[PDB]
């Protein structure tokens, strides 16, 4: 295949994909602005990327399933603390980055990660939209947080729910591994505090990463003692805001079977809500990652789990 | 099509044959307890296999027989947590099932069907020492059951209600008998003084007005730790006719009870309900276990086992 | 107390039979007022699973089948064009309350008798004809006995099964679900017995097939037997044809929701090819051994059993 | 605001069509530079499920099908020897972003028109030919409409389905997945419509079959029809042949992952024998109604649907 | 070093002595009963690590044995043989693949252990080896042992969705996608009759042609049916070997396999061919049952057990 | 009518071959650890694939190979929660499976088979510094295992026992070796001083007497919250030969461990076992993980991972 046909087409296809996101973001931004009475609106951007996974790539299929579950007929549209999701200023959908089609053009991982970052900035460029990213595997948090921090001009504090620290300097030769985005984030200087919750699978090399970057890694084996800390968090003060990343496998596999990495002895769903509902600070973006529909039960319980996490994060981020 | 005159006569005769069946089963079990002595109250299972007042899935219509079988699953023994023997008929007994499907198939309307459920409950209460423990079925059945208990005893009860949902909608999709409204109906009839709800985590702002309008004590999951010592030391019924306990299986976390229509993540642990139930003080005069849905259960029927244990433990507290 | 026990048994059983009688009276009067009907397939549930040798979940089948007949994903027309919304094509009578009756301490002979009387109550109301929903396969004996007594003679039987169900003595249970057709042949209630789908048969039951002149069609010769099976003509010279369909005659890939999986079974289309072409006066039938507790989450075997009922009803109603 | 809302819909629809156009242009230029190709089956996903009558899960199918085409448990050669690693044999264009356009308030007529124009954008790039991935079966109408209009005449259609999909009015939805071939026959976009697998059909739709000269082959005559259906010759005298493959044409034991289980369907080899021997200039086709939300944990129906795509593409590419 | 290999050798010899004593037992039992010329003897090879997608067939042998002699399934084969008669079928045991692997033993030596285990069975007249896989790679060391022990070639009847004839599959000489390449290269087979084939690359079609393999594809099954249901194999060589890959069956009937290939054989297709096969059957195998991909009810274990029961009836005499 | 001289000869020779296999494997691993140095105890896995003493389902016979595979699942890493590296043979190693099926097929009775299991455990203990961590198999195997550990060490042990059931039935269905009686056999033999049970939620009144008779310390789920400070600070083994840890997988709630034979709702969370086991003080001399039933697990094999993690965390506490 010729080099010119490749270089040009890649840019044409990528330009078209970004234009679609830009038009959708303009549509929703204009809508919120014509409604008034809104300071921030959680805006869903799907990033259906699985190929940085180390075991199973099914989370690539997650974003459309999460969006549907948000409106399951078995549920109502009010959040636990009383916000109405039927209000467009509380939550709106922007769209999905077309990862598979862009990848199919022969685009490399660096450029792909750059398209993700540009898509996040398109959303942030429309006041009052704030990005709530649907994964996809956890690799997407690096290009998302990089974009948020670049757009805001400074660091954020990060609340990170995970069974895994995701701080590998080098996982299997993949800079963009879903096991490394937070090493990428701390290397770039995009985060101040990194508060990790649910950790129960961590190697000794990564324990040195935690020490090196001043990460606040809360392990399940101390959760009873750490609970008053985690349920009283005040992040962001002094920097540009707070970013909340929620890996669905932070929950016990009994609660969230639909994930690639089962790690028994995880969080209860009410643990995450307690922490998230009590969190103080200016949330400027977030993600819900690693829901894997291909490993879910036939009743789609993990789609509902992921949807409720999105609903409760949106209630905290919209203003 | 068919003569409405033919329908009305069929409806009366079929309803009368169904009530006569329940009466003879109740009279049977009544005479059996009274011949055994040493019994002041016997929890008596009445199935109400009704699902068509559900808003999402009707599979709980099939629950009551699956619950009764799980009470005697072969992987389990017959003793309750605090030592009561389920092989003792005075501890627990089965009356039977209201044949909802066949009555509905006569063209009976929803008001009449609710009246059949109420009359079935009164047939049970008529036989000393039986007390009704109702197996749903969706939660709409708590209205005609609680109405019956209250009418038969001649006064209000206090209600302990385990649920993810307050079930207090004034008007849910135009169905007065919606499973999302039975406690709005109960409060409108004044059948309950106190209504203590536990497990709540899905509530609309309109329904919050209902809670304050009727003085309901609605305990939400986000305050359960703060509320725990109150709830594990409950004392109900004093001054009125007794205590009624309604257990919605979806009050439990979906990881523990997947066999329900309405999955709501972040629910009660099975031990949460037992702590409250086993510690509850007051004269339990009836109760129900509702919304188990076999069609959404795991292949090994884990939620049937869950629902049976709830029935087992409520019976231990009601029988004496 | 022995007197309290007989009297309660009499009175519970009587009230149960009155319920069935009143339901059948209603549906008979309904069809007779509609007119233009010689026979209406009428569903009688027999939720009995305790004569099973492995798993008793088919006790729960009858209500699941009735629901799947009207599943929202299907339409109400049979493959050859009958409309199930026509009450003359199919109607529900009710379920015998087996659990409540057995809970009165009634023994198995009296239980079998209550099933027989319930069937006869359906047949008493022109033009209803009984289509029984099991329940395990033991119920076929009291049902066929009732049909044959009420009609005054023998019937021919078309019987779909993976197993002959012809054991003289299965683990000491006379009413075992693996013995009902031995009981039927012993009583002379049936003349011809044509079994289709057999792939699990002991050498001891092979001598029961010789003894009674059963026509046993085994899977291994299905291909050669296909012209005969797709042109069956039963009942001529006797009182009619009774069709018993054991759901586990179907391959487990099609019907996972059964107690006894036997690989290499019938395809669903094999049963329909035989049933839709069957000539003869069908006077009753049954669909048994659907076990909801062994079905898949989608309930495919409920739909399978419902479609067997729908297609049997299309042939029995006229 | 209406006039503003319309301008926003227009810009969003335009950006979506531009994305499909650049993807088709890209793949078109790739095939032409490779040479030695007359037709390349080109996958266009239409993730639409909201015209379904029972379950909308087939909205999620296209990306699962594409992944299964390259499952690590399979190899990349089709049964008759074509290599899927050759971009000339199969290639992906993209998915119409149905959800995001619907979310602008676009109504169903405009949505169908966007589908039609997307198909035309593929056909505009020689030598791409559209192989559409549903989505529910409603998409076949705007797809066949676009194929017929672009080619300038009628096509003959080979249609695998449990259901005729010929309802004049299914529940008030003109775009119902139970009516696309009514819409196709009304518009004159097809000459012959040859349906295979039919086993769920109402009497009003039997009248539709007669009214449009539809050749509806029901399962109850499959063995008799087999020499006809396995030597089909379509499209001569018209603009070509279009193949619509509804996955629920297969028995649910083979394809559980569909919204409408209908027991007694085709075996997979039945479809292959017909499709592999089909003669005629295939100008387009689709594979519809795979529902991953009702599939088994192993995703067998995704593999079933992928193999149908793979074999259809073997016949269409040349 | 040189010490390491002596330590592995003690583990291997202990494993082979276990097999030898079990075969010794069953061999003595048949000879004392009398009235028997051949007894199908089950040898498990719980090996899954030469699989290209999923290794779960490593757990198959004990699941299959349980389904042969289990509950709610009678004990007579289709054409009438008594499975409670030890002369019709008997269990020898399982090669302890996992423990030998855990000693650092390489794949060539592991395959040698498999061959020698087969030969210990053949040594105890009248037992004949019926091997339970495990993935299909085990057919190579098994057939090599059968042929070496009999001193000549065998004709092979092979049921499979896949020809398993890759000369080189992903650089693994012992790949489960290559055992019949290894068999043909080794000169252990004369005829190779393959049935059920519906997944074959053009490179492998060249292998088929080069070795004169008789590869019957599903797309021509109907017209091949007369030839296939009157097979006569083994005349002039040392006997017939029957290899049954469970994924030859349609995945609707046999979902418990690693490689789902839609459009497979019906259960009756295999049994018609197998039961009408003429020729002296000297060994066989049933491979690629994967319990970790079976239904919760284990229907494929039942499928695999029935295949084993019908092969045993044909091999025992 | 099968010659007994032939059977008995097969029994002795097959059992000898089987024990010689375990001996050589133990010698292989023991030599390896001695050549590596810096080790005082290495947890060594011994499988006992026995399910025929189960009262409901025998599927746990298939567990040991599944558990070992899940210890190295590609989705996990090889570091335990508190930092030990399973890739280090001194931390965990495999010995092998007792071939229960092949020995039974020789006509060996249940006493002789329990004896084979005991001698296999002693074969592991002979090789310094291996310590037995037994993979079941149903819970009947704990009796011959603890018998062997006690005899080899010459005295009693204290036991930490995780279970939904006390397993203390004197006579369960006429089977002396029932999986519901191994701790009655242990206590009759005097191989245990203290028996601390955790997770108990299914206990009959008869067995309540058994607990009294042997001084068992039976902590029921009913009191878990009060008992948590005691159970998460356990000091066992002082004054005797060591501590044996028996983990029955059905101690965990069925929502976590569906792949067991006996589902009993309201059980332990996985974090409950870890909190107790990671904080346990005492010289652990052996352990087992029993009753994982792969045939009742979900298709993702979650209970295999659950069991594997329990083995991984027990090995971390036993190896040193
Ligand atoms: N009984 C359950 C009612 C559920 C309903 N979605 C609600 O809004 O509560
Ligand atoms: N994001 C999940 C990474 C999982 C990997 N096995 C690890 O060792 O962390
Ligand atoms: N495309 C499927 C339509 C199904 C509908 N129940 C019918 O009667 O055709
Ligand atoms: N034994 C299975 C081999 C499967 C392989 N993907 C093939 O190309 O045949
Ligand atoms: Mn993670
Ligand atoms: Mn993560
Ligand atoms: Mn409720
Ligand atoms: Mn509720
Ligand atoms: Mn049968
Ligand atoms: Mn039968
Ligand atoms: Mn269709
Ligand atoms: Mn269809
Ligand atoms: Mn193979
Ligand atoms: Mn194969
Ligand atoms: Mn236990
Ligand atoms: Mn135990």
Numbering used by the authors:
A (entry chain E): 20 to 338
B (entry chain F), F (entry chain D): 19 to 338
C (entry chain C), D (entry chain B): 21 to 338
E (entry chain A): 22 to 338
Show me the paper's own sentences about this structure.
In this work, ARGAHs from two model plant species, A. thaliana (AtARGAH1) and Medicago truncatula (MtARGAH), are structurally characterized by X-ray crystallography and small-angle X-ray scattering (SAXS).
In this route, ornithine is obtained from arginine by the action of arginase (arginine amidinohydrolase, ARGAH). Similarly to other eukaryotic (Di Costanzo et al., 2010) and prokaryotic (Bewley et al., 1999) orthologues, plant ARGAHs, are binuclear manganese metalloenzymes.
